Amino acid sequence: HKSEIAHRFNDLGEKHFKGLVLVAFSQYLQQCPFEDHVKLVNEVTEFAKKCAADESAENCDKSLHTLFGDKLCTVATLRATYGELADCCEKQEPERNECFLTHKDDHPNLPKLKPEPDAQCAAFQEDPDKFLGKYLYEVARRHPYFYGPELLFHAEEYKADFTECCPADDKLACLIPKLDALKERILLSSAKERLKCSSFQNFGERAVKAWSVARLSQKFPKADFAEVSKIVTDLTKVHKECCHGDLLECADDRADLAKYICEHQDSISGKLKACCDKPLLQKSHCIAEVKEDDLPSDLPALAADFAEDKEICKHYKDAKDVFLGTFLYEYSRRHPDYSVSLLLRIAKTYEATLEKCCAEADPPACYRTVFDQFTPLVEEPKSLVKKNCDLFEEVGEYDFQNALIVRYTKKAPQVSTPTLVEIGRTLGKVGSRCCKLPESERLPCSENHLALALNRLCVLHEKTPVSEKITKCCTDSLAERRPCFSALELDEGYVPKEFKAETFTFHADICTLPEDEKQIKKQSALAELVKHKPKATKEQLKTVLGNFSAFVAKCCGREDKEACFAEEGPKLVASSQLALA
Length: 581
Ligand SMILES: [Br-]
Ligand SMILES: [Br-]
Ligand SMILES: [Br-]
Ligand SMILES: [Br-]
Ligand SMILES: [Br-]
Ligand SMILES: [Br-]
Ligand SMILES: [Br-]
Ligand SMILES: [Br-]
Ligand SMILES: [Br-]
Ligand SMILES: [Br-]
Ligand SMILES: [Br-]
Description:
Elements: H1 4-12, H2 14-28, H3 34-53, H4 64-74, H5 78-82, H6 95-102, H7 117-126, H8 128-142, H9 148-165, H10 171-202, H11 205-219, H12 225-243, H13 247-263, H14 273-276, H15 280-288, H16 302-308, H17 312-318, H18 320-334, H19 340-357, H20 363-367, H21 374-411, H22 417-435, H23 439-463, H24 468-476, H25 481-487, H26 515-532, H27 538-557, H28 561-579
Helix pairs in contact: 1-2, 1-3, 2-3, 2-8, 2-9, 7-8, 8-9, 9-10, 9-15, 10-23, 11-12, 11-18, 11-19, 12-13, 13-15, 17-18, 18-19, 19-21, 21-22, 21-26, 22-23, 22-26, 24-25, 26-27, 27-28
Residues 149, 251, 254-255, 258, 280-281, 284 line the site of one bromide ion (BR).
Pfam families: Serum_albumin
Protein name: Albumin
Subunit structure: Interacts with FCGRT; this interaction regulates ALB homeostasis. Interacts with TASOR. In plasma, occurs in a covalently-linked complex with chromophore-bound alpha-1-microglobulin; this interaction does not prevent fatty acid binding to ALB.
């Protein structure tokens, strides 16, 4: 392949190629107007066609990286709008892209994209191409590590929704449920993918493969070890390319993998057939989301091979990584009911046990009981989910979020209020989604979702580190991350944040906010109450918040809203203090 970009263009097709370039640019250059991005995509795409037709043309042999980078450095507003991102252009590859990646913004704080059915159907009417391009543009800029080929797929869902619902008399009736569900799907996928990219960055490729050996062994328990390994090797390569911004290569390799999975579905899983009848993007998504296959009925006990066999230290000496990979695959396929981290924790203990045991002068004797060690590990997660789902089913979502906001704020009161509020809200929604699920599916859902929320917190906290405890938990070890967070507790040495009346002062402009923005303001007040009076109980904190909430509702219902806030406000701010002693 003389020319990489011809090759990409040839393999991907003009539409998706175009689509991926729009996405890539929107992730790198998050503020630029949609129109500026359209032009860039068109330029790159032109040059691609020149090359596909003639690979000797000036510059067609340069790497995609180099071509994209040079293109980014061309932007007329780069310095003006993106500032020090412009300094990256002085660097050379591969450092240039590294430098660009660091400057992707994980908290871009763009206006909340909400469904406006009368509005959007008519935008869908006025110009559709701009409409489906904009969607990709808006999602990409808000989620700078979003999984390239998956975004193009959600766009199609987006198109299919509008095309169906905009003709009916009752567009909103049809439309809103659909868009609401799609926002949720986007959030979850973006969090899933950010965790992969975070793992590459902080723990490396090894950690990403183990995580993936576990997950895929659970999904495809029927598959033998060499399949799993092959698929995992290819999928890691794919996600590494996407996390680094190489969306064309990412996508091209992803189509190859989807092809491979579909040509070997008999040897992988029986739940693949419907997926493998689909067009490309649908097919890849369908595979990404496939239900776990049924446990096979011919699997032996793991003891024989992993506790009883007397040459185990021998094997473990010769092929450490391989042999432990074999343990992880075997253990994970038997346990479709465990979170990926729990599995990884288990594997780490096994590895640790062998190194301990294999120095002792009779290793069979001790590692004989290695499986006893996994009991307490399995049990802890089971307790946390039961503790949380119990609280959730009792008090409802909003109260659950509140209880989590308080709990996390006590653990890490230095962390910003916007971040504390976000994790707590996110974790409340996990309660709604996960708790109603069968126990075989509840542990994994809440713990796999919890992993994603902790990662988000660590991503935000790494932008501007403020708590050492948090850094330690975020950077020590992916498998121990949840236990590390669970162990955090209010430090005896924490100095309360000094009181600031303004921080608890509300005004009428809250009345015109969306409900969820209303709750965010209230929930932010909650976190600050905790920062100022950290020793206050959750029950005292719930009462004070109830009083602010009753105050806001009333004043927002008043004829003279502003007079109500002005008179009533200071009374609350005063009494709040004493209520939290
Ligand atoms: Br170009
Ligand atoms: Br993202
Ligand atoms: Br690329
Ligand atoms: Br794909
Ligand atoms: Br096969
Ligand atoms: Br802290
Ligand atoms: Br999250
Ligand atoms: Br933070
Ligand atoms: Br916890
Ligand atoms: Br006011
Ligand atoms: Br109060």
